[PDB]
């Protein structure tokens, strides 16, 4: 108390010794991550440029921007893992998971940056997209929100693990759905395949967050969690309807708003709480 009464966070003199495994649930998630290892080089991008060139300008604009957003957000997730989560959690099985997540985030960032480089030849445009946190207003609200949770010296691990589940689970959900929409339109195999791998990985990262949350003795209240999750949903809805409208690629903004609330509800249930919006998933393709 405050942290000595938390198995996840309390002193572990065996933290750097791997065996024997004591948290089999946590360990199995690390094994799952390790088993689905992939590299950017495995994704075949050789059919994408033709499809990219056939797109309308506004579609290319939307796609390049979603890519820039993902690449930038990964860096924030990564920073939080490197500076906070991988340091403060003292159980070996979780340290292994977080260590592997850091490695996978670098691969995700590389994949996005390689997609940018493949589609966008102009070096000034590449640089613009790489520096999205500073160059792109659409990205700011989400980036600032995530970064505040890294700098927050008060917020408990319980609150911060929820916030990052919201980053990887709510902040990414609209953009993931967007690319699955492109798949439904039969467009850009490399983008859509890499999107399958990455959203799968991110789903696993959110599942892990929920597992860690359940292992906590002093959780934040349902009220506090609702508050964090609702805030995140509103930011994500703003991003997809105002800052970078999904209309640009032919999607229904109204149904997209509903999808984000469905996603949040599922996260809430997975965190062991009650649904908040009680809406259906409007997308058959998700």
Give the annotated binding-site residues for Fe cation. Answer: 74, 105, 108, 168, 202, 205
Residues within window 147-206 making contact with a copy of itself, judged by CB under 8 A:
none
- State yes or no: is 112 an active-site residue: yes
Helix (H, G, I), strand (E, B) or coil at 15: coil
Residue 76: which of a copy of itself, Na ion, none does it interact with, CB under 5 to 8 A by kind? a copy of itself
Stretch that binds a copy of itself, among 76-84, 156-164, 244-252, 276-284 (CB under 8 A): 76-84
Residue 247: which of a copy of itself, Na ion, none does it interact with, CB under 5 to 8 A by kind? none
92 binds Na ion (CB under 5 A): yes
Residue 264 DSSP code: H
Q: Which residues contact 105 (CB under 8 A, 6 or more apart)?
A: 74, 77, 78, 81
Stretch that binds a copy of itself, among 53-61, 94-102, 154-162, 232-240 (CB under 8 A): 94-102
The candidate with the shortest Cα–Cα distance to 268, out of 235, 236, 220, is: 220
From CA 266, how far away is CA 143, in angstroms rounded? 23
Q: Which residues contact 248 (CB under 8 A, 6 or more apart)?
A: 58, 59, 61, 62
Cα 140 to chain centroid distance, Å, stands at: 16
Residue 279: which of a copy of itself, Na ion, none does it interact with, CB under 5 to 8 A by kind? none
From CA 199, how far away is CA 205, in angstroms rounded? 10
| Catalytic residue (one of 112, 119, 157, 259) | 112
The DSSP element (H or E) to which 254 belongs, if any, is helix 253-270
Stretch that binds Na ion, among 8-16, 52-60, 188-196, 200-208 (CB under 5 A): 8-16
Q: Looking at 63, 64, 78, 142, which residue binds a copy of itself (CB under 8 A)?
A: 78
Handedness of CA 158, 35, 200, 275 (dihedral sign): negative
Cα 147 to chain centroid distance, Å, stands at: 14
17 binds Na ion (CB under 5 A): yes
Residue 96: which of Na ion, a copy of itself, none does it interact with, CB under 5 to 8 A by kind? a copy of itself
Residues within window 101-120 making contact with a copy of itself, judged by CB under 8 A:
102-103, 106-107, 109-110, 113, 116-117
N-to-C CA span, the chain: 42
Stretch that binds a copy of itself, among 82-90, 194-202, 211-219, 226-234 (CB under 8 A): 82-90
20 binds Na ion (CB under 5 A): no
What is the largest distance, in Å, between two alpha-carbon atoms of the chain? 60
From CA 202, how far away is CA 195, in angstroms rounded? 10
Residue numbers annotated as active site: 112
Question: Which residues are at the interface with a copy of itself (CB under 8 A)?
Answer: 14, 16-20, 34-35, 37, 39, 41, 71-72, 74-76, 78-79, 82-83, 86-87, 95-96, 99-100, 102-103, 106-107, 109-110, 113, 116-117, 126-127, 130-131, 133
């Amino acid at each position: 108390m405050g942290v000595e009464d938390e198995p996840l966070l309390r002193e572990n003199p065996r933290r750097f010794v791997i065996f024997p495994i004591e948290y089999h649930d946590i360990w199995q998630m690390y094994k799952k991550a390790e088993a689905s290892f992939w590299t950017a080089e495995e994704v075949d991008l050789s059919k994408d440029i033709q499809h990219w060139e056939s797109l309308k300008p506004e579609e290319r604009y939307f796609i390049s921007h979603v890519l820039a957003f993902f690449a930038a957000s990964d860096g924030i997730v990564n920073e939080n893992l490197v500076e906070r989560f991988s340091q403060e959690v003292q159980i070996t099985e979780a340290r292994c998971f977080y260590g592997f997540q850091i490695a996978m985030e670098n691969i995700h960032s590389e994949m996005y940056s390689l997609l940018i480089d493949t589609y966008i030849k102009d070096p000034k445009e590449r640089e613009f997209l790489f520096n999205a946190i500073e160059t792109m207003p659409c990205v700011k609200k989400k980036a600032d929100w995530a970064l505040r949770w890294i700098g927050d010296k008060e917020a408990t691990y319980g609150e911060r693990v929820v916030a990052f589940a919201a980053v990887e689970g709510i902040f990414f959900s609209g953009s993931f759905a967007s690319i699955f929409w492109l798949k439904k339109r039969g467009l850009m195999p490399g983008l859509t395949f890499s999107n399958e791998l990455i959203s799968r990985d991110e789903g696993l990262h959110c599942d892990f967050a929920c597992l860690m949350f359940k292992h906590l003795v002093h959780k934040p209240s349902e009220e506090r969690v609702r508050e964090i999750i609702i805030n995140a949903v509103r930011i994500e809805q703003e991003f997809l309807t105002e800052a970078l409208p999904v209309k640009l690629i032919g999607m229904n903004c109204t149904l997209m708003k509903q999808y984000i609330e469905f996603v949040a509800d599922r996260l809430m249930l997975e965190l062991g709480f009650s649904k908040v919006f009680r809406v259906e998933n409007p997308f058959d393709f998700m």
